[PDB]
Structure 1
Amino acid sequence: TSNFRVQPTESIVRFPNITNLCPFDEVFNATRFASVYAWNRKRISNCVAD
């Protein structure tokens, strides 16, 4: 008729403890932006994003 499974009891989260505050303001709060004919790319990695 039915199925029997055990529901979870609590919740656990685990993130890496690296904290470097990814430079979103460097690409957002910048004075000059490149044109559409020649677009620039910046790689963001190994930090924490908000």
Structure 2
Amino acid sequence: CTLKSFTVEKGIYQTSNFRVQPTESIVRFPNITNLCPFDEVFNATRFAS
């Protein structure tokens, strides 16, 4: 497939690169959880000029 031929001559050929694949996904985020005050900004009665 690499040489694009069905007949391969004698020699050494670089074909691909072996790489080990990941096994599982780990997400690390800060443990602290506080509901963010988007209500104060977006639902306010009065805005500034």
Query: What range is the shorter-chain TM-score in?
Result: 0.5 to 0.7
Deviation at 1:34, TM superposition (A): 0.9
Q: Report whether the alignment pairs 1:7 with 2:24.
A: no
Deviation at 1:33, TM superposition (A): 0.7
Runs of 4+ deviating beyond 6 Å:
none
Q: Structure 2, unaligned stretches of length 5 or more?
A: 1-14
TM-score by length of 1: 0.62
Deviation at 1:20, TM superposition (A): 1.4
Q: Structure 1, unaligned stretches of length 5 or more?
A: 36-50
- What's the % identity of the aligned pairs? 100
- Count of paired positions: 35
Which has the larger displacement, 13-22 or 23-32? Answer: 13-22
TM-score by length of 2: 0.63
The corresponding residue for 1:17 is 31
